[PDB]
Symmetry: C4
């Protein structure tokens, strides 16, 4: 809020925090959005089967890999923006409390961990690589819809918990029912109850497991009941989430 | 809210009925939830072939089966809780009227029936085994969302009946239509009308039968009509159920 | 109120039209519902491949076919009920205006046409046979939910028309798009635009065509757009239909 | 609403713009709707493989192709109507501002471009042929529901943008999750992240990819989360679109 009053720190903060403050602020916001989108495209295209061996980018002095070059450019821009915001913040105590800044730090972390490891062990490497996808959330800084979605999810945590709990109850119940209904066959597509968990989830969400359906009569009755109960139970805590989203979406206007 | 008044039955009743009454009450509630979850996990993992022919656990003096040990421990805890609640209840006349106590009683019955059978014949044994899954509802004592769902279902029995009746009407109508539309084929995937019941249910719920679709033109028109009518008819009595759920869910605050 | 004044026609009319009038009226209503359900079960079970070739029942003096016996008994009961109601109606002018009597008449018509054909070419016979399924609507006389659904459909004719028209627009648009996107393939699952009509209907209703999906990139973009647009367009006129149903359903009590 | 006032231009404009003006206006409206439907049927049936090959019509002096004859008749009627409305318009300044006239012009363009090409080279041919499908929107002139849908879409552009943006976020996130969950397999159905985009779209819309499902446990957890999140995120900005549609639909009466 309050400018630093240095006549230069306040100007930089207002340029890098309020896109509507001036023309260069809008240009910088557009550039940041373009860089984020380019980083997303590079992250998606690194996994393409046509193109290191387990990290997606090979570090070299000459920077032979084009994907490494693009990732390095994006990380350099992100680090510049984050450092400049950190230096130009009026109150640096509350800088680390904002989620929109933790998203920014967590999007730069995987690059430096990989570089440090390579300069100086496979499951953790892939875990770090998966954290790279969390930089798509940096669009929340420039998208008000994404911020509204974040507020809705924060305000509807109990509702999400109830939805997951109800789905868990239904999944276990109908998995047990469909296992015990189709247990007396030699070609049972549900060998056990855990094997029927995903079928229960898919039937309840009405995604549909394709042609893999129960073969018995009791199995088909259980499948029909599962299809009904999924619609009946998912749609109970969803309307309150939609109401919260509408409240947070029309509050901006 | 009536205390036992014995100065000793009251202490046990308040500990085992009001988790918020003290610290040990909450510890006991957490322990009970953990035991219920462990029993659920054991029930699900008994059917896994990787880790006694129709029940999933062999009762023996040596207790060789770990699953038998886990089930016995869970049943002992459930029986302890139920017996202590039954003894410490202020009014024992209304104890058996509460659904939350019938759920607790019906979750201990399958273990003792199996024990009596083993101490002293196949389909009924599997039926009793299927009843074991009803102990997942013992979480309703510790989950307010589950109690709210129970109240919603109690208050919306007419609406569930209408939903099932409408689904039955649509299923029979569209099964007849799709059987008679594709009757003049040698490779008809719908040999009869009962064979087309599950396809009708799956199309109406928009679960989707995968690649199995009518091959004729009239069959495809009937399938399109079924897909439309399922959405059109399932979504009529569901909003009132959602309204009942919202009423029972916001009535707490 | 104004009684029929016959002193005998009124007694029969009140018995066969007002189930709440007395105990025998309730017994007759229960018997009629049971007979309707038995007729429905017989109609569904005639088509089973285990159990003449174009009518489902072979007419004989001895009545060898059990299905013919059941159909004859149900038709005799329906004709008795219809004739007694027609004779005992206070105003016979408005008897044929009620839809609940046209349903009753049209459920007896297929039986006598078949009897006349047997006693005294093929497509019309199967058309008449398909008309037999309309006797499931005779439950509307004894079910208030079915009458409420009928009133809702009468009051939402424009809304159903708009839903069908919007689906037609979307189906043609997306069928053209997915044919033109996947035209340049030798293994194209969409040889023409009419062949892509049902895929468009199924994608729009989110039923899902299984594993048959466009193989190109533009085809997959068109499929994603179809999946979005179906949800977005079916859900526009459905809420007004739901509102009409709620109005006709809460007005009952 | 002001007539041309020429006593002949006004008469033509009122005949060709207000169907309720007289009987001939209604006859002309019915004829125009029939011609539009005939053109749509011809466009759909041109692609049928039973019947040059990359343009949809072969030009000859004798007009051998029946489809060319039908398309030429439809285009002649459309051009006559458009020219007569352009000549009979009261104010030609606002003629090009109405969307219902731009739709009319674009639906006639592909025929004249193609004719000029043949009388006096592959991808843009597909583009032009795809543009032919826009003549289905000429029904908006005669259908009030289509105009209401157009108003709803114009008034809900931000909501559509949010829906597409949320879809893109979810698709990228869940495609990355399901690629990295099923990366350590030799039979991985998701070779890369772009190859898993359409699976994510189909799962989120609950269309269902048939029997193609993740084989790992983490893959199935990601699939279940995708199925939940699709329902949870598509249904947030859709209710506001439905509200806009209801506002534009009940405003007539
Ligand atoms: K589906
Ligand atoms: K679905």
């Amino acid at each position: 809020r309050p400018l630093p009053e240095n006549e230069f720190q306040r100007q930089v903060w207002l340029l890098f925090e309020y896109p509507e403050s001036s023309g260069p602020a809008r240009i910088i916001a557009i550039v940041s959005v373009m860089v984020i989108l380019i980083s997303i495209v590079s992250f998606c295209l690194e996994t393409l089967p046509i193109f290191q061996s387990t990290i997606g980018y090979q570090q070299s002095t000459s920077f032979t890999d084009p994907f490494f070059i693009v990732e390095t450019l994006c990380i350099i821009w992100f680090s510049f923006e984050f450092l400049v915001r950190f230096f130009a913040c009026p109150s640096k105590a509350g800088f680390f409390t904002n989620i929109m800044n933790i998203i920014d730090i967590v999007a730069i972390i995987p690059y430096f961990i990989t570089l440090g490891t390579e300069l100086a062990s496979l499951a953790i490497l892939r875990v770090i690589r998966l954290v790279r996808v969390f930089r798509i959330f940096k669009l929340s800084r420039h998208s008000k819809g994404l911020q509204i979605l974040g507020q809705t999810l924060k305000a509807s945590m109990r509702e999400l918990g109830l939805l997951i709990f109800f789905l868990f109850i239904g999944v276990i119940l109908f998995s047990s029912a469909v296992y015990f209904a189709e247990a007396d066959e030699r070609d049972s597509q549900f060998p056990s109850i855990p094997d029927a968990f995903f079928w229960a989830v898919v039937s309840m969400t009405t995604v549909g497991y394709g042609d893999m359906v129960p073969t018995t009569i009791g199995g088909k009755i259980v499948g029909s009941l599962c299809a009904i109960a999924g619609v009946l139970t998912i749609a109970l805590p969803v309307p309150v989430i939609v109401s919260n989203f509408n409240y947070f979406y029309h509050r901006e206007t």
